[PDB]
Design a protein around this ligand. Structure first.
Ligand SMILES: C=C1C[C@@]23C=CC(=O)[C@@](C)(CCC(=O)Nc4c(O)ccc(C(=O)O)c4O)[C@@H]2C[C@@H]1CC3
Ligand SMILES: C=C1C[C@@]23C=CC(=O)[C@@](C)(CCC(=O)Nc4c(O)ccc(C(=O)O)c4O)[C@@H]2C[C@@H]1CC3
Lengths: 407, 407
């Protein structure tokens, strides 16, 4: 099986509109979370969100936008960034050996709702002719494959909050097994009340911190009370090692493990044992110690702990365990986009020799007092191997491991 | 790479609620298409649909239904059928070597719309706590993985109308490459005005035959005027050959090829050349002649022809070309569910030694007069190898080839 490397990255995030802005936010623990006044207007309990700040119309032209939801438009931007970063020619983007696996947690729920509303108010014709590619679950792959003239693999993986981790893993497999030489992988999510309300109604999102929105997302804090929802996108360019070397690619890291498992337990809560099996599977092909763990940790009361226990079972406790820092405390939870964004955060930390603070821990939950959760940024650290988990409703688990390429 | 066989099938279709009913419909060319009065009430142009007739509440209990949309409930039924057909024990369903890749074209659009409506009418809390797993794009895998206690792979592929063909293909790859020994693969789609209107607004669905609904879907007819939308589900049980043999499995067929490509051309129309490359890729590993082609052919004016041209380029014309019969003329177009349902139709035709009529051709489009489109059921035919295409918006292509297992 061939080796697979990351040669370009692109990102639209609550903590920055490119990798430079994101790096600065991670380094300085600058929260991306703000008050969502619209949610207050609609009567939500949770009134906080992690919103990108980026001018779409300046970066994607009107004709491309014809078939984009906001999430996939952010994905388009991230794709442009990743192609530029990688330095690809048009020929390298558009060829039979180059594909795309790009997903989202949901489609454009706003398109679905607006279409239903206008059907009832003004008639079906007034839905307009461009709604299907926004409303279908493949929207992220469909739009980008068409606009970037992708000729190889073209589909989306959907796995709720694991989505873009699986997208990367399956793209990794496609290259390992020789079917493709280059893949664009990642995903996106719109940020919209029509999705967010589904989580508010289940009591899944933070509401105790509405008066201090910036600190509402606080994985591992004793008084965490739900995740904070976010939108955005991320893209990695993946290539087989020989293809990358031959064209003088920048190598951000090598993908060296991937796990994917299923809990078979509860629809909306994790079992823990599925995560253990997932991490073991990702680690089974890894031959160095892990220097940093980017957990799934979303700041829910019932979510953060089973993952820590799974980590304990694999890695042990205290100094022997790798440092753990939950980036969702800064970024919120971008659902479909979170796996790829966390891969990018981890690869940027590797590049810049620091591990970010696990932010907004005002009082550590004592159940985690034995674990090396990062309370202050760690500088001048040589990260060679990093692990990132993502999990999703329906008991779906994905883990990726990336390594500094040294030959 | 290991060999992979189909050992069980399940289906909920506009042309039957199990494989027996479906076989009878195919044999007798009994249309599943009816008037959709609701679409007339809402002011649609198209007023026809392909609706399942099955009593969900009698087949899936209330607690399972908590997290099901209608599409995934139909998928649950099909899963139960496939497990029964395969004769699997509980242990064979729930184990680390057994996974699920199950998808839909969209999530429950009805859940999304109802939730938005009730938020605005009665408040966010009244959305209730069970909406996320219905509204997320992974709904088909999430629900079934949780209820059937799946422990291995768990995710959805989404690729619009190619969805369940890719789901089968990727499951096939997982087994070929040794990662899993058994997979449940397929998909589903709800049938609901909140999805169907998106296609009516683009003028994609048949409207000239509203007064004769049963014949509205008519692939290859000169006067075809759009597809006819449908809902339902299908599931295949896939196993590595040694696993199947060792337990005395029924073998419906062997998966012997899979292609997946991308047009990189137009959002909502096919290029043709992508389909050629897709079929060549599926055929590259096939060492017998094709005895039957189940086309994607949806009865659109601009869709049916580029596929026929691609078939011409690969297979030639007239007697040398394999017989072609478009099952969508009977079934309509179940979007996410159509790939797996067409695999099941093809495997049932193989089992029963007939090729169904390509229905509702009252006047053959002269552009296809050189092609062996089946005008009357062919009996007493030995099908050993069959090919099925599915394509989707966003230029996404998937082809599968199945073969009678003879050692
Ligand atoms: C049945 C319950 C109990 C309840 C109690 C405490 C909780 O923490 C939540 C809110 C979320 C559990 C969880 O982390 N799921 C969970 C999960 O398995 C996988 C992923 C995520 C994610 O956010 O990415 C996730 O969130 C659950 C969900 C629902 C309502 C309250
Ligand atoms: C820009 C146009 C021209 C127009 C003219 C004639 C047509 O036939 C349709 C309606 C559909 C083309 C098509 O088959 N797409 C198409 C496709 O590429 C892939 C899959 C399917 C499918 O149904 O599964 C499909 O339907 C197109 C779509 C849109 C409006 C009218």
């Amino acid at each position: 099986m061939r080796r697979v490397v990351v040669t370009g990255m692109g990102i639209v995030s609550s903590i920055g509109s490119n990798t430079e802005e994101v790096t600065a936010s991670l380094r300085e623990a600058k929260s991306g979370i703000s008050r969502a006044e619209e949610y207050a207007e609609l009567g939500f309990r949770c009134q906080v969100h992690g919103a990108p700040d980026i001018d779409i119309e300046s970066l994607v032209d009107r004709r491309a936008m014809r078939f984009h939801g906001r999430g996939t438009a952010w994905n388009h931007i991230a794709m442009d960034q990743a192609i530029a970063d990688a330095g690809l020619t048009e020929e390298e983007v558009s060829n039979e050996r180059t594909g795309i696996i790009m997903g989202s947690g949901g489609p454009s729920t706003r398109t679905i709702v607006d279409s239903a509303d206008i059907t009832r108010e003004k008639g079906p014709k007034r839905v307009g002719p461009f709604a299907v590619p926004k409303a279908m679950s493949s929207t992220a792959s469909a739009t980008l494959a068409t606009f970037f003239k992708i000729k190889g693999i073209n589909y989306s993986i959907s796995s709720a909050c694991a989505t873009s981790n699986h997208c990367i893993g399956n793209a990794y497999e496609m290259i390992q097994y020789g079917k493709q030489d280059r893949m664009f992988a990642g995903g996106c999510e719109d940020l919209d009340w029509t999705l967010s309300v589904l989580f508010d109604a289940m009591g899944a999102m933070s509401s105790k911190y509405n008066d201090t929105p910036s600190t509402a997302s606080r994985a591992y804090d004793k008084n965490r009370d739900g995740f904070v929802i976010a939108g955005g996108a991320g893209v990695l360019v993946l290539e087989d090692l020989e293809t990358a070397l031959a064209r003088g690619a920048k190598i951000y890291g090598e993908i060296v493990g991937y796990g994917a498992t299923s809990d078979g337990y509860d629809m909306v809560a994790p079992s823990g044992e599925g995560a253990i099996r997932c991490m073991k599977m990702a680690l089974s092909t890894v031959t160095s110690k892990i220097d940093y763990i980017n957990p799934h940790a979303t700041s829910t009361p019932a979510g953060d702990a089973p993952e820590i226990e799974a980590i304990r079972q694999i890695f042990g406790a205290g100094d022997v365990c790798p440092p753990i820092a939950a980036t969702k405390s800064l970024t919120g939870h971008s659902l479909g986009a979170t796996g790829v964004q966390e891969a990018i955060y981890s690869l940027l930390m590797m590049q810049n020799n620091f591990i970010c603070e696990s932010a907004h821990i005002e009082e550590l939950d004592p159940a985690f007092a034995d674990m090396p959760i990062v309370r202050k940024r760690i500088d001048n650290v040589q990260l060679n191997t990093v692990l990132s988990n993502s999990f999703g409703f329906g008991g779906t688990n994905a883990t990726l491991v990336f390594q500094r390429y040294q030959g």
